[PDB]
Amino acid sequence: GIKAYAQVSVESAVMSASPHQLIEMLFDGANSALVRARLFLEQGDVVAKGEALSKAINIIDNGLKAGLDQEKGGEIATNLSELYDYMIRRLLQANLRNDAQAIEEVERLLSNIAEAWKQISPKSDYATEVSNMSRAQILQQAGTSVLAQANQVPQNVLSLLR
Amino acid sequence: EDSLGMEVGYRLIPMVDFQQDGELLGRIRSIRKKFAQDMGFLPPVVHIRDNMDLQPARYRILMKGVEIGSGDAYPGRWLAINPGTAAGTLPGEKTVDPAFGLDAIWIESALKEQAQIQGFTVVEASTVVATHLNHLIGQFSAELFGRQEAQQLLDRVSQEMPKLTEDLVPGVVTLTTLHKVLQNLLAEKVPIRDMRTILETLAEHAPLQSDPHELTAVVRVALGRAITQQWFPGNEEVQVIGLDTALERLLLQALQGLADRLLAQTQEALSRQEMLGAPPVLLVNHALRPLLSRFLRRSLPQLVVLSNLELSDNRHIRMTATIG
């Protein structure tokens, strides 16, 4: 019953997802985990906070960063890889120091990239400029950014979100 | 009319329009694809029409023109479903999930993660209808397997098993008998993926057996290990319900009134299977198995009736409930 809605919510969306839509689910899945880890930390549940951050780190590392293609991507892939390494390093500090603003800036940097990715459908201060450069590359270079990021397998997206 | 149809209000058109967002349209095609993967045949399409007589956010699932399910689905809102152990209070539209009977509430997208903090299963609007459709096509998996679904499936196995299909149809087994047997498997939640064994078993017993129900029992015991795994994966503890050794000597004799008494005790046994987490499986003698399966599952469709000959011998078996 309860697991039926949770299973269909992910499986029915992954099986019909294009290579571009598989990346959208990783951004949306990582965003909800960061908000969960933020709300858990605001209440005091450090255990649940650590569980939510581990899911967010797993989506960014083994999903978004794992789907990066160096050769076909070029500058877009490496710029996202450095930007993804900053998020993982900041979320590890957010779980070890119980820092809430560290989750918020990663939540903000991910949204700065995901908003540009949702509009490209196929047919501290230094990290912000790194995301702005990636945001401009995604909007101005569509196909090369799809070759850079949209390379994940539906089998991997399911296990990361399930 | 339409074997599988769906009528939606005008508010649900963007979810079923390929030119717009169309989230619900893509989910139906995923459920149909997993249907074709799990059960073993391609089900008929879900023809989607718009009905302005319905409420804006109202949908209706049709089958042969007969309504089998309906409910509400608000696009911009999320459905936070309560498993029964979630705390806190959410603002929104209190309701009940259409596919089942759990308490749920339609909330704004901003409270999506907040609802998950309090222990709610939050799904989008297109998922609410997709889950309701997936829950319904599984119950009617046998009715979705017509003669054309059996003919195309026979042409598929003809390309992969020409040596078996050549002499089997239509000489040994007719398409009517072949469709009757395969539908009997689907009627009791056993897939027909292993077409190697099904056609092979028919090539062994059909020259000496013409009754499709007798062929179904023989094909089912050949798929015995597959049926054992779909209810007992790995080498777990087989936890089934059993009949009293006395009661077997009552039903066997009737085979060779107080049926309401049987119905009452069978329902109790299913309730105590929910404790310890055991499947609603009814293990019984091979002679009683086909009779009380077509009898108990009329009012208890969730009950699964098994036989001693199809349950794997080399496994940890143990009775849990008792009807007697």
Numbering used by the authors:
A (entry chain B): 6 to 128, 160 to 198
B (entry chain A): 360 to 615, 623 to 690
Article sentences:
FliD and FliC are found in complex with their dedicated chaperones FliT and FliS, respectively, in the cytoplasm. Here we report the structures of the ternary complexes among the FliD and FliC flagellar proteins, their cognate chaperones FliT and FliS, and the export gate protein FlhAC.
Similarly to FlhAC−FliT−FliD, NMR analysis showed that the highest quality spectra were yielded by a ternary complex formed between FlhAC and a fused construct wherein FliCC was covalently linked to FliS. The structure of the FlhAC−FliS−FliCC ternary complex was determined by X-ray crystallography at a resolution of 2.6 Å. All contacts within the ternary complex are formed between FliS and FlhAC, with FliC making no direct interaction with FlhAC. Two distinct binding interfaces mediate complex formation. The most significant appears to be the juxtaposition of the FliS N-terminal helix (α1) with the FlhAC hydrophobic cleft located between the d1 and d2 domains. The binding interface buries a total surface of 680 Å2. In addition, a hydrogen bond is formed between the hydroxyl group of FliS Tyr10 and FlhAC Asp456. Amino acid substitutions that perturbed the binding interface decreased the ternary complex stability, with FliS residue Tyr10 and several FlhA residues in the binding cleft being essential for complex formation. FliS−FliC and FliS−FliCC (where FliCC is a construct consisting of residues 454–495) have the same affinity for FlhA indicating that the first 156 residues of FliC do not contribute to FlhA binding. Specifically, FliS Tyr10 and FliT Tyr106 interact very similarly with the FlhAC cleft and the Tyr residue is absolutely conserved in both FliT and FliS.
